[PDB]
Amino acid sequence: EMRLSKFFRDXILQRKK
Structure with missing residues (x-):
């Protein structure tokens, strides 16, 4: 459910961090 998540x-x- 994210894009960053890679x-x-x-x-x-x-x-x-």
């Missing part, structure tokens, strides 16, 4: 879901959460 993003966040990809790298700012598992890392948290």
